[PDB]
Design an enzyme around this catalytic site. Sequence first.
Site, mmCIF file in Angstrom:
data_model
loop_
_atom_site.group_PDB
_atom_site.id
_atom_site.type_symbol
_atom_site.label_atom_id
_atom_site.label_comp_id
_atom_site.label_asym_id
_atom_site.label_seq_id
_atom_site.Cartn_x
_atom_site.Cartn_y
_atom_site.Cartn_z
ATOM 1 C CG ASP A 1 29.108 -44.786 -40.434
ATOM 2 O OD1 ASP A 1 28.610 -45.195 -39.445
ATOM 3 O OD2 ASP A 1 30.247 -43.994 -40.372
ATOM 4 C CB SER B 1 42.094 -34.041 -42.862
ATOM 5 O OG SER B 1 42.808 -34.911 -41.892
ATOM 6 C CG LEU C 1 35.095 -27.335 -44.227
ATOM 7 C CD1 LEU C 1 34.205 -27.779 -45.744
ATOM 8 C CD2 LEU C 1 34.616 -26.109 -44.100
ATOM 9 N N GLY C 2 36.758 -30.297 -41.163
ATOM 10 C CA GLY C 2 36.291 -31.243 -40.285
ATOM 11 C C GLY C 2 37.529 -32.451 -40.218
ATOM 12 N N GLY D 1 36.603 -39.705 -37.999
ATOM 13 C CA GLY D 1 36.877 -41.183 -38.594
ATOM 14 C C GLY D 1 36.936 -41.118 -40.318
ATOM 15 C CG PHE D 2 35.403 -37.675 -42.288
ATOM 16 C CD1 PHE D 2 36.175 -36.527 -42.417
ATOM 17 C CD2 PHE D 2 34.358 -37.632 -41.313
ATOM 18 C CE1 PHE D 2 35.986 -35.516 -41.638
ATOM 19 C CE2 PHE D 2 34.220 -36.507 -40.802
ATOM 20 C CZ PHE D 2 34.994 -35.497 -40.964
#
EC number: 2.7.11.1
Length: 274
Positions: free
Chosen positions: A135, A19, A12-13, A16-17
């Site tokens: 953030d 996978s 899904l993404g 900077g986090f």
Amino acid sequence: PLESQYQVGPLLGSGGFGSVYSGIRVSDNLPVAIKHVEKDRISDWGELPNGTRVPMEVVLLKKVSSGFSGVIRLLDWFERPDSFVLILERPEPVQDLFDFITERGALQEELARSFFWQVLEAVRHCHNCGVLHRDIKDENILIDLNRGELKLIDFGSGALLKDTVYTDFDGTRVYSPPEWIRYHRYHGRSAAVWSLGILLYDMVCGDIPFEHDEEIIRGQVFFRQRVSSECQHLIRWCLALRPSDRPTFEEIQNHPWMQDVLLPQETAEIHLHS
């Protein structure tokens, strides 16, 4: 047994986090989100209540997980050879505020008032649970489109809330206060308020006010879209160059532009159901 309990779904993404994959908890077919964090890449670590060492991100998620829907919830977690895997709620259908803002552009104030309100309760929640997000931004906010509820996500740059000065920061520059930019120091609450201000401008103008270092420090706010005077006020107030001069959470929520908030569902019927 990690890979028995869940059925991997689409990535899904990545950002900077790390996978993030969609997943189903086979045990009850619950829609969940599986996130992988490499050990090598975690620079901030923390101690579980039990006290054993995990990535701070996990410490922070445990602390806010009970009992609110304002914040994404950590179901469970696992350690591997070089990664930690986190199992988190997955709302559907869902869209994140950035994508939402990119499709539909600048938002009606009635709608931005609802969202912004919900973000405020979710930041209070974190602060209350002893957690500082660090953030806050459109990207780290999900809209559950049926319920019209907002969820704050991605505690990867967060920190345990404290009353003293922070001197580290690995969040999104453009949402960071002038005093970070100029002095590498800031206080949690005041910096959160600043970021809450950029977010508001963003909602109501469809894009962030400050792009460059110099404009953040200069601190002077130009509107590219018709915005109510009361809203421009809360915005310029949230973005006061001097931290002590910024509005507390109470004051933001007692502001005249904050009045008459739609309920979340109500907000979905009126704005999200096409």
